[PDB]
């Protein structure tokens, strides 16, 4: 399980 914080990410 991975949270992505950024522009262009899921």
């Amino acid at each position, epitope marked *: *399980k*991975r*949270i*992505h*914080i*950024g*522009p*262009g*990410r899921a």
Partner: antibody
Amino acid sequence: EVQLVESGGGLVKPGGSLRLTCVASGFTFSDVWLNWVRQAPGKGLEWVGRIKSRTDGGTTDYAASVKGRFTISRDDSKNTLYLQMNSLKTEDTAVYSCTTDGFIMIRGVSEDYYYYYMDVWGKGTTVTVSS
Amino acid sequence: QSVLTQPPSVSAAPGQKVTISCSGSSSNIGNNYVLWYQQFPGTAPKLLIYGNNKRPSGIPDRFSGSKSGTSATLGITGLQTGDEADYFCATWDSGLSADWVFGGGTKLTVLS
């Protein structure tokens, strides 16, 4: 020992073309997302666009101010990022540099958080659009 | 001529506190996370804060960050002459091209 070295900058007449190249070293190039940013004299940093990794589709995004005229591409084969500029306008005059999207990873209780940011930055190459 | 707005400069004496604001819109700061960078003349920007208020290893807690609505702030306590540099905020636009957006930078002078 990471770095990004761009080149190809110079003087171009309004309407002309220019091709900037950026070479990377010190990390696995194919795995990172790349950005082109620019800073005109006096103004603030402006994001030009990016090209995602091949693993993420290799698609490109462009700032509204350059879509249709600029094109980004990568050659993972030789750690090189490209910026083809067409129909240049004097307002495109600026220092162009490449950057990579890096990340700080934090392990939460149940999830793993990846916070992205422009990590490695090139020194830039100057592009002057003037008659 | 700057997507996010920050005061152009700020000054204080060593040992003092200081804060730098960064104003945006719902489309950027309001919707996402703010990052803060530090830059010294002739060098690449160094990540200072991410996820609005987190510090990367190596960054002392004299540095703090906060975000309220469409505005973000960076604080620095116990100023040292060595903190004299440029500071800019960044985020991304929640639009289709997902632009990285930047502040014009604020020059912080540590009275020497």
